[PDB]
Amino acid sequence: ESADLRALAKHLYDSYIKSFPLTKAKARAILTGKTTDKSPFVIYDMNSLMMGEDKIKKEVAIRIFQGCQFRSVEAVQEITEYAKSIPGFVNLDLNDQVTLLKYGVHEIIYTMLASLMNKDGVLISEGQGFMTREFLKSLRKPFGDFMEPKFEFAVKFNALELDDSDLAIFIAVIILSGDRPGLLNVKPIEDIQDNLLQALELQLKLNHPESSQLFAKLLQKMTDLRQIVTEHVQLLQVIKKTETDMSLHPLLQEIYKD
Numbered sequence: 001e002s003a004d005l006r007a008l009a010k011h012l013y014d015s016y017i018k019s020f021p022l023t024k025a026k027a028r029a030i031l032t033g034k035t036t037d038k039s040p041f042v043i044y045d046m047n048s049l050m051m052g053e054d055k056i057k058k059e060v061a062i063r064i065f066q067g068c069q070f071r072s073v074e075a076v077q078e079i080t081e082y083a084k085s086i087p088g089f090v091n092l093d094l095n096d097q098v099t100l101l102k103y104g105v106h107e108i109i110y111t112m113l114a115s116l117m118n119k120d121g122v123l124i125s126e127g128q129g130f131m132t133r134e135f136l137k138s139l140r141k142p143f144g145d146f147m148e149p150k151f152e153f154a155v156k157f158n159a160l161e162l163d164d165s166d167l168a169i170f171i172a173v174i175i176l177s178g179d180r181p182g183l184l185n186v187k188p189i190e191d192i193q194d195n196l197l198q199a200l201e202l203q204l205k206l207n208h209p210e211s212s213q214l215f216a217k218l219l220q221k222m223t224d225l226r227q228i229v230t231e232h233v234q235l236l237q238v239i240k241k242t243e244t245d246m247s248l249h250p251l252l253q254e255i256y257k258d
């Protein structure tokens with residue numbers, strides 16, 4: 001029943017709103033300069049960084065990087081909450097549950113981080129601030145280009161013009177990918193995704209009727225994502241040897257063991 005699908009879609013979008021305090025709709029009101037109460041502090045140089053700690057809530061490149069690190073722990077929490085709401089997810093093998101989040105967390109983080117970017121920079125601290133692409137990019141080696149690729153993916157991704165309701169389904173599709181390393185029972189996972197894929201199909205058709213083959217165009221983005229992830233992990237591994245005086249959060253480090 002399509003009705004059965006639209007209901008799954010409402011359900012999902014619902015959980016998405018509940019789990020994720022900074023939606024893409026809110027992000028874009030902030031980035032388009034909608035209102036006079038939502039205007040971010042703009043961070044584009046070192047004194048702006050300084051003053052920005054006063055208006056919004058060790059070394060510079062390092063303080064920024066750990067600024068992402070605590071963030072990503074937050075995201076993981078968020079995603080974990082969402083995951084629990086996906087029909088079936090919690091019933092699966094527990095060792096599978098862990099696996100799916102372990103490989104799905106980053107790919108989701110980058111999908112939703114795009115919501116907060118535009119071609120000039122990225123929103124930080126729940127929309128209170130905005131760090132310009134150029135500043136990030138001038139960050140010393142090897143922190144210069146830890147964010148560059150993410151921008152590239154976002155600008156491409158953001159042009160598909162998805163909205164929150166589309167994304168809720170799409171991050172559910174990611175979580176339930178039967179092709180993840182160490183998965184115990186794959187079938188039960190794929191049966192849930194099949195439904196998710198099915199929902200997303202209908203969703204995109206209804207919501208974006210003039211967006212031809214969007215559904216397939218969206219599905220191929222999963223390759224760009226994976227690419228970004230591997231580039232990430234690699235970059236971290238160099239960070240960890242140049243910077244033996246630098247910590248990684250426990251939750252984060254569980255995710256990284258392969």
Ligand SMILES: *C(#CC(=O)[N]C1=[C][C]=C(O[C][C][C])C([C][N]C(=O)C2=[C][C]=C(C3=N[C]=[C][C]=N3)[C]=[C]2)=[C]1)C1=[C][C]=[C][C]=[C]1
Nearest residue numbers: 052053057063064066067068069070071072109113124125
């Ligand atoms: C990444 C992304 C971001 O860049 N996110 C980000 C980056 C930098 C900062 O701040 C830099 C100094 C101003 C922030 C702001 N948030 C924090 O660092 C932070 C907020 C709150 C707390 C705290 N709150 C209550 C009690 C105690 N502490 C601490 C720190 C945000 C990135 C890269 C790749 C993927 C995703 C994200």
